[PDB]
């Protein structure tokens, strides 16, 4: 909020130490944002009475004649500049705050200005620099300093939460302190009203927008500026004073969450209608605008026989021209409970942020309008003289709060505590509750202002708040989890274990946003984004990622742009959205790669990253093949899709040079699988003890043929006793019959029992030789050399 200390001590005196308070509150739940000392009134600012105001010829200035207890002039330019009021004179030679400069005796247009009368900002009590301060001319003995009656102030910025709409007025707060042990001094503004008919009616049209309405009548108004203590207050809160009548409207708004408007009866007509604004209706909203209305808006209007006209936009602004001023002599005081959303939308539509709307959008004591009337009229009767009418116009019957169960021990079984019953009754019974119970279940009815108190549980945090969250002991639970919950961590750990291995392996983890710019779909030649944002952070952070590589490369580029690294082997594992939502693993290679630093030769490129893949896969207990299959984004000649334990989970390849050039960067190699990959359980094969048959050979096969082809054939023709099988030499050219490639294979046989009688490796080799012939694959010891 914005809490003036002295003011709060008005309702709860014996408070002392604003810091001890700030502490008290944050313990109750309110986070004080800042504390501020305000009102450093210079010694040189005294209180003068304006005697006369004469114009200084053909110019805008006015030559006021004052008396700081010794009649003196000062020439002002301000509009409010007139005889009859009290002003704040900054004697010549007075050092001012907001002014920065010092005042002195100065000559203005022919007159000798003896100091100068100050505006609020000038003095420094609020940002209003367009007008002198205005005090009742009888205020303080003409000439006494102002500091005497403007004691400095401590104001604290609270942070009131949405559930606490009673905490938007000093008395809501006060009431909470009272629960802790403080004495509540609720001001009794007992007025003197004479019974006579109020000259206006009140007809409510939409009762579910203004459930509870009230019109009060005070006439005989002597509108003047409001007394110092009241100006000190309004400013002290972060408001500006206008006239005793409107100030009493703000004062009580601040005192108890009740927004109220006083309307000059002049502009009322026959009575106040409260309805939904009819299409084509425009009002000149108080701050000076012509807000063209919408039929969803709720309006406080007046009518003259036929036509119905707008006087203020209900529960938000108003003012228009019906606003209270100098020549006011009677007013209709508005004090109603509006429906939060009928306001909350209307105010979020027109672009309004009023102290009064803010109050209504949260919610107000749906039974506090009547008491609010009295405060305001009694206040108004004192301050403005007004004779008030004992007779309000109450329209809308409100319903008293509902009573909650509350079993004291439930409260305890929940908190782990052991607060005695009695003690916890008092907590509520002195938070202002109706506790009508014999026990053990009590049945409590909350005061009208506590909307936040619906359930029994709302009640428990009430007992554990006054008591203190610092009285709930520490304890730990012991328990046998339910069977089905047992193991849910497993999918997770397997994914976390993958980042670990991907790491010790040799990949630097990167994290990229999940936002994709629609744009990339074309640059990276991929299928169009599935989801788009309704409120993107930027046109480029518009849709979400269908792949991780766009960002991985993007990210890479930005690194060349900044760090000119020589190589990089990153990896990422974020969420990818398209059709469904999946976890993906991707990473790119780049630069020189492995090898020797003082040796001109590196080892890198595709087979590097391809090797890092098999390295990884093996250490995963999984099977890994890359079969060829050009993908849109990859390079046509180096593109294949990753095949883990039988299945296709992703791709591995280079980049399409179109894009490489398109993105200013050089060759990159990458992959993107989808998780989770499978898990193959431990197949414990016991190995044999007897040696193995180390035989060997080579195959010719047609140039544009694949390795995984020859190899799959070799392996299943080799039979069961084959063990290893590794390509150890490749050949392109002659002595080969032009257009073939000799693939050399280290074979290896072993029997899991006796050894191998050799002629057996032979007949084995026979089938391999056979299936090569049965395919068009010649040999070394048989078909080409």
């Amino acid at each position: 909020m914005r809490v003036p200390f002295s003011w709060l001590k008005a309702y709860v005196p014996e408070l002392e130490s604003p810091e001890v308070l700030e502490e008290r509150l944050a313990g109750l739940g309110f986070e004080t944002d800042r504390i501020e000392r305000v009102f450093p009134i210079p010694r040189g600012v005294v209180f003068a009475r304006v005697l006369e105001a004469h114009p200084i010829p053909g110019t805008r200035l006015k030559r006021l004649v004052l008396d700081a207890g010794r009649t003196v002039e000062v020439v002002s330019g301000a509009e409010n500049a007139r005889k009859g009021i009290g002003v704040a004179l900054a004697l010549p030679g007075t050092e001012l705050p907001g002014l920065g400069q010092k005042v002195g005796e100065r000559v203005i247009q022919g007159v000798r200005s003896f100091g100068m009368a100050l505006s609020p900002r000038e003095l420094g009590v609020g940002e209003y620099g367009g007008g002198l301060l205005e005090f009742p001319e009888d205020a303080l003995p003409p000439g006494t300093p102002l500091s005497e009656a403007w004691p400095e102030e401590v104001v604290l910025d609270l942070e009131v939460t949405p559930n606490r709409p009673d905490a938007l007025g000093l008395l809501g707060l006060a009431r909470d302190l009272h629960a802790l042990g403080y004495a509540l001094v609720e001001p009794e503004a007992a007025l003197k009203a004479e019974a006579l008919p109020l000259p206006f009616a009140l007809k409510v049209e939409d009762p579910e927008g203004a459930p509870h309405f009230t019109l009060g009548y005070a006439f005989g108004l002597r509108v003047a500026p409001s007394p110092l203590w009241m100006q000190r207050a309004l400013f002290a809160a972060g408001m500006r004073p206008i006239n005793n009548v409107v100030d009493v409207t703000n004062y009580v708004m601040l005192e108890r969450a009740q927004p109220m408007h006083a309307f000059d009866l002049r502009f009322v007509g026959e009575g106040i209608a409260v309805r939904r604004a009819r299409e084509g209706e425009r009002l000149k909203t108080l701050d000076g605008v012509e807000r063209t209305l919408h039929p969803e808006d709720l309006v406080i209007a007046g009518w003259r026989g036929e036509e119905s006209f707008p006087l203020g936009l209900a529960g938000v602004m108003g003012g228009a021209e019906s606003e209270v001023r100098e020549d006011t002599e009677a007013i209709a005081l508005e004090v109603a409970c509006f429906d939060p959303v009928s306001i909350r939308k209307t105010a979020r539509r027109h672009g309004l942020r009023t102290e009064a709307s803010h109050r209504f959008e949260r919610g107000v004591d749906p039974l506090g309008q009547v008491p609010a009337q009295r405060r305001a009229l009694s206040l108004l009767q004192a301050l403005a003289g007004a004779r008030v009418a004992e007779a309000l116009l109450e329209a809308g019957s409100p319903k008293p709060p509902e009573a909650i169960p509350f079993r004291p021990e439930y409260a305890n079984r929940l908190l782990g505590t052991s607060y005695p019953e009695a003690e916890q009754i008092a907590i509520l019974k002195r938070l202002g509750c109706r506790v009508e119970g014999e026990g053990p279940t009590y049945r409590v009815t909350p005061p009208s202002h506590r909307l936040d108190l619906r359930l029994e549980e709302d009640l428990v945090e009430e007992v554990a708040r006054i008591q203190g969250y610092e009285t709930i002991p520490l304890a730990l639970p012991a328990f046998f989890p339910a069977p089905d919950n047992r193991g849910v961590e497993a999918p997770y750990r397997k994914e976390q274990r993958l980042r670990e291995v991907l790491s010790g392996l040799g990949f630097q983890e990167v994290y990229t946003y999940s936002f994709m710019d629609p744009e990339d779909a074309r640059r990276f030649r991929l299928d169009p984004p599935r989801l788009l944002l309704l409120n993107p952070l930027a046109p480029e952070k518009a849709a979400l990622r269908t792949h991780l590589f766009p960002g991985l490369v993007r990210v890479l580029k930005e690194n060349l742009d900044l760090d000119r690294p020589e190589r990089a082997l990153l990896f990422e594992v974020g969420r990818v959205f398209r059709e469904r939502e999946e976890t993906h693993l991707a990473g790119l290679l780049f630069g020189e790669g492995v090898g020797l630093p003082w040796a001109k030769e590196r080892l890198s490129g595709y087979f590097l990253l391809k090797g890092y893949l098999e390295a990884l896969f093996a250490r995963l207990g999984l099977a890994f093949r890359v079969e060829a299959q050009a993908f849109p984004f990859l390079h046509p000649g180096v593109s294949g899709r990753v095949l883990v334990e039988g299945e296709e989970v992703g791709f591995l390849g280079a980049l399409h040079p179109e894009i490489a050039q398109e993105l200013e960067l050089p060759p990159v190699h990458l992959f993107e699988l989808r998780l989770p990959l499978p898990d193959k359980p431990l197949a414990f094969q016991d190995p044999s003890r007897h040696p193995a048959a180390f035989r060997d050979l080579a195959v010719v096969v047609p140039a544009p043929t694949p390795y995984g082809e020859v190899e799959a054939l070799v392996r299943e023709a080799a039979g069961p006793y084959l063990e290893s099988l590794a390509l150890f030499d490749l050949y392109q050219g002659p002595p080969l019959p032009e257009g073939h490639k000799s693939l050399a294979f280290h074979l290896r046989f072993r029997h899991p029992k006796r050894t191998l009688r050799d002629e057996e490796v032979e007949e084995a080799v026979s089938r391999v030789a056979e299936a090569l012939r049965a395919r068009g694959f010649g040999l070394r010891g048989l078909d080409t050399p």
Partner: protein, 345 residues
């Protein structure tokens, strides 16, 4: 290779064609009229200007663009690689099955609030069996076969770094460390002590020289047998899933009273696996810890404390779970055998 660097230097000839031209062209309108060009407006300020200038763009953007289509094509002929082919021969790596089996059991329990400390392999009679209520000439000494040690030099630092008086040996069980913990620290705590253990035994498929155990305890005020039953169960659940049972039968152990042997139902294994032996710690083990603590001017800590401890050989589970033949294998450090556990999470 061929059409790329040739024309990229050759288009740079055009970049140098824009500024060998850019000067003669900029050395007309800017040099004949800096201050006096808006006086020589029509003809001159339109001919050598506007006209020639558009050349400095069309030829720039054309040798800059009509080069990418022919050069980027030269790379499409080059990397026409065999996608499938053994890639770089990086080393795989991988763990040993005792590590998986150990760590798994270390997790199961840590997840239950347990901490893992590790003790010395080379122990000292007092700490090993003795402090655990196993005095000499005790048929309790006959339940373990000690490798008794001999050598000069070795300094056996005990608990709080102080050197120890006792006879040297190789720890039969990891319990020696159960006491080394209790002297140094104060209760309560829940700890598990894994480590290598050594028996004087006849190496075969089911028995062995060296082995690994994990033992542990939980001591503190109010601990009861019910608690060990609680834990030993949670271990059965997390190891053999939600249809697993535990069984407790009394047995004799010098360091515990009461004592028992847990057996765990292995649902799909159909048999009642054995596993370990545990029990509520013995009163005399608390006296020894306190007696020693006082020797070290360390106030006594286990006066009003209760406490259970358990112990199970890793080595077994590692064979039941990862289905292995004989115990010798692990220590027979064989490659083709070990290589089957490189893939386990």
């Amino acid at each position: 290779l061929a059409a790329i660097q040739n024309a990229r230097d050759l288009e740079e000839l055009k970049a140098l064609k824009a500024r060998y031209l850019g000067k003669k062209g900029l050395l007309t309108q800017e040099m004949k009229g800096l201050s006096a060009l808006p006086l020589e407006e029509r003809r001159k300020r339109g001919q050598e200007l506007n006209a020639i200038k558009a050349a400095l763009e069309a030829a720039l953007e054309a040798r800059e663009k009509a080069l990418e289509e022919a050069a980027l094509k030269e790379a499409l002929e080059r990397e026409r690689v065999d996608v499938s082919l053994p890639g770089a021969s990086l080393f795989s790596g991988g763990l040993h099955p005792i590590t998986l089996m150990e760590r798994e059991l270390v997790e199961i329990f840590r997840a239950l609030g347990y901490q893992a400390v590790e003790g010395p392999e080379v122990e000292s009679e007092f700490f090993n069996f003795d402090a655990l209520n196993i005095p000499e000439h005790h048929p309790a000494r006959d339940m373990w076969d000690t490798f008794w040690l001999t050598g000069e030099g070795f300094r056996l630092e005990g608990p709080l770094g102080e050197e120890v008086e006792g006879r040297l040996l190789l720890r039969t069980h990891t319990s020696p460390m159960q006491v080394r913990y209790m002297v140094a620290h104060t209760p309560p705590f829940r700890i598990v002590v894994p480590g290598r253990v050594f028996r004087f035994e006849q190496t075969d498929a089911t028995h062995e020289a060296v082995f690994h155990q994990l033992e542990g305890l939980v001591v503190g005020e109010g601990i009861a047998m019910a608690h060990l039953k609680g834990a030993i169960y949670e271990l059965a659940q997390a190891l053999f899933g939600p249809d697993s049972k535990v069984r407790f039968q009394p047995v004799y152990f010098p360091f515990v009273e009461p004592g028992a042997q847990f057996a765990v139902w292995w649902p799909e294994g159909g048999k009642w696996l054995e596993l370990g032996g545990a029990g509520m710690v013995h009163p005399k083990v608390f006296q020894a810890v306190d007696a020693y603590r006082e020797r070290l001017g360390l106030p006594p800590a286990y006066r009003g404390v209760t406490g259970f401890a358990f112990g199970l050989g890793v080595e077994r589970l590692a064979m039941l779970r990862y289905g292995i033949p004989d115990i010798r294998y692990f220590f027979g450090g064989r490659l083709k055998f070990l290589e089957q556990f490189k893939g386990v999470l």
